[PDB]
UniProtKB/Swiss-Prot annotation:
Protein family according to the UniProt entry: Belongs to the inositol phosphokinase (IPK) family.
Included stretch of the parent chain: 188 to 461 of 461
EC number(s) on file: 2.7.1.127
Tissue localization of expression: Expressed in brain.
Reactions the enzyme catalyzes: 1D-myo-inositol 1,4,5-trisphosphate + ATP = 1D-myo-inositol 1,3,4,5-tetrakisphosphate + ADP + H(+)
Location, primary (coarse class): cytoplasm
Protein name: Inositol-trisphosphate 3-kinase A
Lineage, broadest ranks: Eukaryota, Metazoa, Chordata, Craniata, Vertebrata
Amino acid sequence: GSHMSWVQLGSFKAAGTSGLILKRCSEPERYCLARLMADALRGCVPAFHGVVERDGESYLQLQDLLDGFDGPCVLDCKMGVRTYLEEELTKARERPKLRKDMYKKMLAVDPEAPTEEEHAQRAVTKPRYMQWREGISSSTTLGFRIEGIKKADGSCSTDFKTTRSREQVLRVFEEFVQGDEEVLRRYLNRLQQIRDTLEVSEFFRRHEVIGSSLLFVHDHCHRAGVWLIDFGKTTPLPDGQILDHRRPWEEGNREDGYLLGLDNLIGILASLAER
Ligand SMILES: O=P(O)(O)OC[C@@H]1O[C@H](COP(=O)(O)O)[C@@H](OP(=O)(O)O)[C@H](OP(=O)(O)O)[C@H]1O
Ligand SMILES: Nc1ncnc2c1ncn2[C@@H]1O[C@H](COP(=O)(O)OP(=O)(O)O)[C@@H](O)[C@H]1O
Ligand SMILES: [Mn+2]
Ligand SMILES: [Mn+2]
Ligand SMILES: [Mn+2]
């Protein structure tokens, strides 16, 4: 019905207009959504209607992706082998901002993960934290990870930081679709069509797509949709340069592994469909 309905039961605010939602405007994300409305990927992303001012602040006016659904179930998949910009690596070398928050979350999961010096600092750099998160989740090996589920019963979970193996990921999707063969078939048809759109997209070949998600939405009526969201760290390649989006990331090459992730994700859902 609406995301803000769920929020009621961060960067998001209720829109006055029916079927819309407001997201705090960021310069890279605004640039991206404007381009995407004219791209092959137009139908694979939420409609972007422009910017509005609320309480002296700028908001993206977006399609509420939950609007067409009756009690939506939602799963957010973070796409890519890398979840931070290469510029974070330069910043942490020349002028590191030590992060005490990130030390704590790391310590909780693996007490032996932090180095002697990180333990002494009670702090880690952002790229160290984000690379560690990639390796204990499925990000590094499979090129995506499950971040969160919101269920029709009102329940939500973010308990997926150690969801890493192909079979662990399959079991989360298995629980998410609750044996609805029609929802799974529709998800797979939509992911196949998104992959085809990404492989021909002018936007996609010319942009490093970091920190974006695939939002899976379904309901008890067997309606099922998937969209790309979150273009806050999606940046153009300089001087008409392109990515293949499959080859491994090496600092300098700006590769995101986006399609390595999507390939693996389709493979897992195709496997689940045959179980
Ligand atoms: O390991 P988790 O607790 O699941 O998530 C860690 C956070 O991940 C964010 C992205 O992931 P998201 O798009 O929010 O899923 C980071 O944001 P940006 O990349 O937009 O800057 C945020 O960074 P910072 O604002 O510097 O603290 C991290 O602290
Ligand atoms: N257009 C949308 N319609 C409905 N829900 C949305 C929409 N965009 C984002 N969301 C919800 O908000 C969550 C966070 O979105 P995201 O764009 O990643 O924001 P952030 O930049 O704060 O991480 C998603 O996982 C989803 O539940
Ligand atoms: Mn996000
Ligand atoms: Mn965020
Ligand atoms: Mn963002």
